[PDB]
Design an enzyme around this catalytic site. Structure first.
Site, PDB file in Angstrom:
ATOM      1  N   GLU A 138      -4.298 -10.272   0.670  1.00  0.00           N
ATOM      2  CA  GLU A 138      -5.115 -10.159   1.872  1.00  0.00           C
ATOM      3  C   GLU A 138      -6.561 -10.436   1.491  1.00  0.00           C
ATOM      4  OE1 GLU A 138      -4.509  -6.369   3.760  1.00  0.00           O
ATOM      5  OE2 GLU A 138      -2.337  -6.390   3.422  1.00  0.00           O
ATOM      6  N   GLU A 148       0.825  -1.206   0.000  1.00  0.00           N
ATOM      7  CA  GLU A 148       0.000   0.000   0.000  1.00  0.00           C
ATOM      8  C   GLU A 148       0.862   1.260   0.000  1.00  0.00           C
ATOM      9  OE1 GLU A 148      -2.608  -2.080   3.212  1.00  0.00           O
ATOM     10  OE2 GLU A 148      -3.841  -0.463   2.395  1.00  0.00           O
TER      11      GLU A 148
END
Ligand SMILES: OC[C@H]1O[C@@](CO)(O[C@H]2O[C@H](CO)[C@@H](O)[C@H](O)[C@H]2O)[C@@H](O)[C@@H]1O
Ligand SMILES: OC[C@H]1O[C@@](CO)(O[C@H]2O[C@H](CO)[C@@H](O)[C@H](O)[C@H]2O)[C@@H](O)[C@@H]1O
Ligand code: NA
Ligand code: NA
Lengths: 989, 989
Positions: free
Chosen positions: B496, B420
């Site tokens: 994820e 991220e």
């Protein structure tokens, strides 16, 4: 099989669509010479949690009572430890399924014993002036009837039931009934017999009802008098006597009195009169006035009037819906003392005693029927009783009892069908009934914007902008051309506006300017007169007001019940001080050269003869000159220029340049009145000779340098933070920029329009304005004068996780005696968060001083708080108050206490005095921090910490009325910008 | 003028864009026979609040230390009372203005004394394996260098600085630095020297770096071996010995081993080896495997693999980022014990010791570089370091140290650039560097969806729907045809997914079915392995976990840190029990006729020889039959039908009709392994002979009637409420419908899509589902059998201010022994609120019993909780637990503990047993109410009140993963509907 449930018959009655049964015809509340016995006093009371477990143990007979205890009557029983109050704004506290009632429904059994002498025979009645919400009445065990309409009167004939000697009155009161669905006022839900219970003898040949018709012909000055009198619903022979006017006439005939002094809120002329029959006589106060709508204006006695009104609920912080008479007289006097001239009985008829006081003191009254179905809005008004034909008789009854009771009082200038009850056939039926019965009073109802069944166009919380379009008659048209034509010919009134919740209300002045400019605008009624705070005394503690949720409510609306101009004990909020000024009936514009003042009479009927006009020139150390000037009476809506004595102008001219001085001209009462003593201030104006800006100190003292401290004259700085640690020995625990304040109630309100529907308080939390951090960029000592030095501290302020910030540069200078502080502010990056521009609460500085302040003195606007869109009541002058008195005791602590427009200030910390001067700034001093203030839900949560939080603001945001109605107006908003401002500081002895 | 600020030079270094200075070249972590001295132990520690007040008092010399105290090293200092932990998810805890640091920046001065023997001369180094975030290193007062990259290793040459005998090591550690802007992992912010500090001798003619290349040719079975060895960055002569394979070769040459047993997570074959030079030898574990992308599939050793993974942070509830080795070994064994086969080191390299354990136990590892700039997203990635050329060298350094340290371990099958961190030139530079240096491992990075610089397409929390479109290769195209072509040829991984926060995760099965159906899908890694709970011991109290905000954080993200499959002490959450089942490597479908079962080998390489296949038939009173069946080894991805012994089928056939019985077939370990003992359960399947529905009792007992009570056999009813007050002597304080539960963490999550952006919990509060009220409509006793009677109680349930409701009719019947209860539910009105349909949490009943329950027994799914979209790990059988063990110890108390699919239940209250039966229902028993549960922020807030809250649900809602990712899937949602269900009750002795 067969029903096995209990209480089904008691419940079936509570679920009735009909009015109360067994009652006598509705009639006027009349002062009569008939014998009367008030049964007010200590009754016996039993509480049950529901109809299904309300005992049927013959309690009505008063013999062998078990479970009964003492309770005062009249009373709102939850105010006496029997249950608790519960506040909801719009929400119903019960499932919405009319006409059904919840299983949890307090049942109050009331019982009293009394003696009836021979004067109450053979005919008498029992009068109940209010029962919330459903009552059943027995006298000596026999049922008289039931009551519906909690704020309406019921009378029950007891002939043949009342027995000479001892009698037993028994009343069962259910809190909730089908009538609750139409009594959804934003209010404390308070069951009980909360108004008078009276036994009245009814002699033969008496008088049951009276209808006064007292018109005024403003061309001829004639009074048009016709007094009707009836018995059993039939007109009867009776004589009408008005001594002051030399009048003897029979009831039922209309006569023309050659000359009468007309009645108005300004001049409430009342003629004592009596209408009498053989067996009974009743006393009346007659005020001659006529009401008419003409050229889209609401006119009384031939002239358009301006309503300077408030919305008056009936509440007492200890007795609930029981308002003691001496509190009524007091609060109404307080209204007059603040230039109020109109009242809306939101949202139900008041106590009967209210009407005579309104006649005598002078208020234009909008008398409102007990009807509100607000809680049906959330379902698109499905099942709204206002449009359910099964509710017609019940709602017509409510209107009939409303009108019949008060139809004789000159102060009532409008009938209102109710409040926030939607549209519907039953509202039209109530209007049709009222127009037939009493055509002398126009009809009001805001809930139907089409205005099909009313005579005035009424709205609540319409913006200043929309109000200005209406005043010009250019609002958008209704789809139906005929209805549009009707409504455009109506005058416009704001039955609720400038919501006075918490810090505020802002934007009052902008409304008022429109009221004065456009005749179609009738004015407005502030929401609302009082906060409904309920006194709670803390265990081992002082009192404080409680609001919604503070009494265990499963469903409530918080502190929206505390939204008034005065607190529950009638102590003014700052908003009332500003309101009084905004609606002052005269305008005084003091000439700049102090040669005179322009005086405009803003009243509608009276001249200026009741006022004495006084002037005073005040300076640093007390008054220099003053006196009285005689003013030839000025006609209503006329102007003149009043010369002042030459000594005043000569004084200003000879004033040394830079010396402050204030000329104030006041209009006070020349003589005592029914509502204030002589010298009471009604209007005022001012002209200020401003003081020159303070010269910055000469930077002759140089900067000084130690390992961890810097010293520049009287200031000590921390070399690590660059921020001062002491000034003149006064410890400085912190100094930083401020952009935020503890949200007001308005800031917690959602501001409609635009894609941002977060309240301002939420916009601030998301932006991190409450949690600012500062980074030091550099410290630099620069060459000053004659060897001295200025000190510049460069910082940047921002918040965690944000890229936007502000560069703050502090430049210090001193000559050893006074410190010069120049603050420069500059935007860094774009102040946008979550797709919306961030707005600031202020641009200022917070000084946190390590010692307590006992006294705050300043020259500026005062004595009470002022913000950009408020403070009209704050006048220029010199003020000084103890720290505790700088605060405002709002029930939910919030930002307040700022003093805008301050030129100089002085804080007294122990034996020393800290003096601030410079370009105009706003001043606030508190013994606690903003985070403690914001966190505090009630005043007891405010704890002093031994410090002084001093706020000096270069710019402030307005407060608006976003809690309900317009937010801050554009000219008062505060967008991130660059700014710079100077201050001068000094500490003495 | 001149700068007067303090600490400007220390701050300038913290604000550096560059990597640490003075360090030796990055290299592998190698087991070496060189002398070594670990300096771990009790150091001396001083804490300062900022650089500007960090003393410059010569402390580095270790002489005359004032303010220093004992502190363990390695350590995360806030875990030892020096400051406190602080958790933020995305938020930076400091103003975002890179590379600047806040004024509040804890500075940790570390110091230790140690002895250096002659073996550390003339050449040695100091190794630091982790310092968060900025370290400066002195040895005997001379500066060695600085460290950047908190989870990366640094080595400093001490030749000529290390002195024989006593030495003083001094390290200054700043919590915040410019490196914090690139270490924004959703994590506890924990400064300190948190990994080993080692003194290492570097003998001449030694070995500095090694690069193992162990490929596998799956066609021939050949191993492709090449072991590089270098000194000072130059290739050197060294001998490579692999005894087991009869290999002597020189470092730097590539050979072909005729036959090797390949390495995989299933079969982690490791060959011990040593590479040695004159002065030094280093030991290695070599696993032969090759990694390739082919036909859009991620293949190892020639076969597509399925990743059954988790995201592993490093956390310990007492030591912070210090994970003791025995906890690492334990938790990794626990992973294997739950069929996990892959790990993502979110979001930084782990402790060096982790890599060897992963090689030995068997995990496909995604090793991730220490990089995350998440907090820049909220500003549209403005100033994102990932695209700032000034950060290139710093980010390339992070990737280099990441790769060099662990490049020798076969368990690492992918390099990940970070997490991220947006898109940017520096990410491409890191990919370009890695591809050149180590082309044998594909590159992973989710942050750039275009996938321009990666070899696999990675996403996080993509819905089941989007995952199915990707598996079919029909996802929407990228605008750039060339990039689209590249990405469509990539396999897809969910780095994820199925966010395991609180009660949940739901929807795991739907993902898994896609993993099995589409080869392009590589699988997924659950977020996350562990909750980062921190143990806090209450004053006069037991321990509980604290999360964000519980340590005084000004800015935090609450309990989002507790979002794991196990708690901080590695105790499984129910989600891990379900996960294990979902990802079980074998599928066992038990035949309905009990004649056999279908066995599919879901593994990728291994056959079924390691497993023993056992069966057992269990009934009401224990096991009836069981044993082992021999299964010829089944190939990977093959199937067979395994016959069971005829005695099993014969047993089912001869079973009396209506008798419950459960056949369970399990695959356990036939022998001990490195991660579990023999008999450990790996996979299982079942076939259930359901019990017949319970016959309703004959309504022979009639209804009985007293003034205030009704009696129908063993049940007593309150005639007022119609609800039972006792059953068999057990007090019933309340009985009512339920439509609501205490919101899970997922219910507090906003469910994107559609115009409703309120979390489900808020939709419920607005609808009043938490505050239901019931009104009695009627009670009726109706004719039953042989004189007996049924009792019907009609009610309506709703909430205050709502027009929608539900009609609930309870029909009771009894024969004196067992009670028959039929509940009928019917919608009244439209269940819409605030413009959106209301959804229900359930359709059930809440029994509140006036006595405590000690034991709960049931037949259904267990032993752990199960909800519509969870409970895969709950198998059919008979269960019995103490009341406390029915609950789930989630850190933030919330709805949990329901047992779906229950056929019968038995509560033991003291000496008596309450039995519930009927059509399948969900079962929950608690010693506290739902309102207490919802209000509880931490477990200590849960107080038993001496009652039993029994919940019997006809329908339940799913739990989903709305806290992050998909909400409840359509098939598991619960919309208002009509429903009816039967129960039978009974109380014994
Ligand atoms: O004006 C009459 C005068 O009498 C009073 C007091 O006695 O009331 C009496 O007169 C009534 C008729 O007006 C009779 O009903 C009765 O004798 C008695 O009420 C006063 O009310 C009034 O001033
Ligand atoms: O294989 C060598 C053997 O020797 C040990 C123990 O003495 O290490 C020594 O040998 C090193 C060279 O391998 C020399 O540097 C030095 O004599 C000493 O480290 C073991 O590590 C190893 O098994
Ligand atoms: Na308004
Ligand atoms: Na997911």
């Amino acid at each position: 099989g067969r029903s096995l449930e209990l209480g089904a018959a008691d419940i079936q009655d509570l679920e009735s669509f009909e009015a109360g049964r067994g009652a006598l015809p509705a009639r006027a509340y009349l002062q009569s010479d008939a014998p009367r016995l008030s049964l007010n006093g200590e009754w016996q009371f039993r509480l049950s949690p529901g109809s299904r477990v309300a005992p049927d143990d013959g309690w009505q007979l008063g013999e062998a009572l078990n479970g009964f205890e003492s309770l005062p009557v009249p009373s709102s029983w939850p105010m006496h430890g029997h249950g608790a109050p519960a506040y909801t704004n719009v929400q119903f506290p019960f499932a919405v399924e009319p006409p059904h009632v919840p299983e949890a429904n307090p049942i109050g059994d009331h019982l009293v014993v009394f003696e009836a002498g021979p004067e109450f025979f053979p005919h008498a009645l029992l009068r109940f002036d209010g029962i919330e919400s459903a009552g059943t009445v027995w006298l000596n065990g026999v049922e008289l009837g039931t009551t519906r309409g909690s704020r309406l009167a019921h009378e029950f004939d007891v002939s043949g039931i009342l027995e000479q000697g001892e009698n037993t009155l028994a009343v069962r009161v259910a809190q909730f009934s089908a009538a609750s669905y139409v009594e959804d006022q934003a209010m404390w839900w308070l069951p009980g017999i909360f108004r008078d219970v009276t036994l009245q003898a009814r002699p033969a040949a008496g008088i049951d009802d009276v209808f006064v018709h007292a018109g005024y012909d403003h061309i001829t000055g004639e009074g048009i008098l016709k007094v009707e009198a009836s018995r059993g619903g039939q007109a009867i022979d009776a004589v009408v006597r008005v001594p002051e006017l030399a009048l003897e006439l029979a009831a039922g005939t209309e006569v023309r009195v050659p000359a009468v002094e007309p009645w108005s809120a300004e001049v409430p002329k009342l003629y004592e009169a009596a209408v009498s029959a053989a067996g009974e006589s009743v006393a009346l106060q007659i005020g001659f006035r006529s009401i008419a709508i003409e050229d889209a204006q609401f006119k009384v006695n031939g002239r358009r009037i301006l309503l300077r009104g408030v919305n008056r609920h009936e509440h007492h912080p200890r007795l609930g819906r029981v308002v003691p008479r001496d509190v009524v007289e007091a609060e109404l006097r307080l209204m007059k003392q603040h230039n109020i001239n109109a009242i809306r009985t939101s949202h139900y008829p008041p106590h009967p005693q209210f009407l005579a006081l309104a006649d005598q003191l002078g208020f234009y009254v909008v008398l409102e029927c007990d009807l509100e179905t607000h809680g049906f809005e959330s379902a698109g008004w499905a099942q709204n009783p206002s449009d359910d034909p099964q509710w017609e008789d019940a709602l017509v009854d409510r209107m009939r009892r409303t009108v019949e009771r008060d139809k004789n009082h000159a102060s009532v200038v409008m009938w209102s069908l109710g409040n926030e009850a939607g549209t519907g056939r039953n509202l039209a039926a109530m209007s049709r009934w009222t127009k037939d019965r009493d055509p002398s009073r126009p009809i009001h109802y805001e809930g139907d914007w089409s205005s099909e069944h009313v005579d005035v166009y009424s709205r609540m919380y319409a913006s200043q902008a929309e109000t200005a379009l209406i005043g010009q008659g250019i609002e958008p048209a209704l789809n139906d051309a005929a209805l549009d034509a009707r409504r455009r010919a109506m005058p416009f009134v704001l039955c609720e506006y400038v919501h006075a919740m918490g810090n505020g209300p802002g934007g009052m002045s902008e409304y008022q300017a429109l009221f004065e400019k456009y005749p179609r605008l009738m004015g407005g009624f502030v929401w609302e007169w009082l906060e409904h705070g309920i006194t709670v005394s803390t265990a081992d503690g002082v009192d404080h007001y409680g609001y919604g949720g503070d009494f265990g409510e499963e469903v409530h609306d918080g502190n929206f019940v505390t939204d008034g101009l005065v607190d529950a004990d009638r102590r003014p909020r700052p908003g009332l001080l500003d309101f009084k000024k905004v609606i002052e009936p005269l305008r005084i514009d003091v000439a700049r050269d102090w040669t005179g003042f322009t005086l405009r009479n803003g009243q509608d009927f009276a001249d200026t003869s009741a006022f004495s006009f006084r002037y005073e020139v005040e300076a640093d150390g007390g008054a220099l000159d003053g006196g009285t000037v005689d003013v030839a009476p000025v006609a209503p809506q006329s102007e003149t220029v009043v010369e002042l004595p030459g000594s005043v102008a000569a004084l200003a001219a000879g004033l040394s340049d830079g010396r402050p001085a204030v000329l104030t001209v006041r209009a006070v009462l020349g003589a005592d009145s029914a509502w204030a003593d002589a010298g009471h201030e009604v209007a005022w104006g001012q002209s200020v000779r401003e003081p020159g800006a303070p010269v910055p100190p000469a930077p002759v003292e140089p900067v000084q340098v130690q390992d961890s401290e810097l010293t520049l004259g009287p200031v000590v700085f921390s070399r690590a933070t660059g921020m001062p640690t002491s000034i003149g020995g006064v410890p400085v625990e912190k100094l930083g920029l401020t952009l935020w304040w503890a949200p007001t109630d308005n800031d917690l309100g959602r501001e409609w329009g635009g894609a941002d529907e977060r309240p301002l308080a939420t916009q601030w939390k998301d932006a991190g304005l409450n949690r600012l951090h500062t980074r030091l960029l550099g410290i630099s000592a620069n060459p000053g004068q004659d060897g001295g030095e200025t000190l510049t501290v460069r910082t940047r302020v921002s918040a965690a996780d944000k890229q936007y910030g502000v560069l703050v540069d502090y430049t210090w200078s001193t000559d050893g005696e006074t410190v010069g502080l120049r603050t420069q502010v500059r935007r860094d990056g774009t102040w946008v968060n979550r797709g919306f521009e961030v707005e600031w609460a202020r641009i200022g500085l917070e000084f946190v001083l390590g010692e307590e302040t006992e006294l705050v003195s300043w020259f500026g606007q005062g004595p009470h708080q002022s913000y950009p869109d408020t403070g009209q009541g704050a006048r220029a002058g010199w003020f000084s108050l103890p720290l505790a008195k700088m605060d405002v005791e709002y029930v939910r602590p919030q930002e307040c206490g700022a003093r805008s427009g301050s030129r100089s200030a002085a804080l007294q910390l122990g034996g020393r005095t800290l003096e601030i001067c410079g370009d105009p700034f706003a001043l606030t001093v508190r013994p606690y921090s903003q985070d403690v203030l914001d966190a505090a839900a009630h005043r007891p949560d405010l704890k002093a910490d031994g410090r002084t939080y001093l706020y000096v603001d270069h710019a402030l945001r307005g407060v608006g009325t976003a809690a309900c109605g317009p937010g801050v107006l554009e000219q008062y908003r505060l967008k991130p910008r660059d700014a710079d401002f100077i201050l001068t500081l000094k500490v003495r002895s």
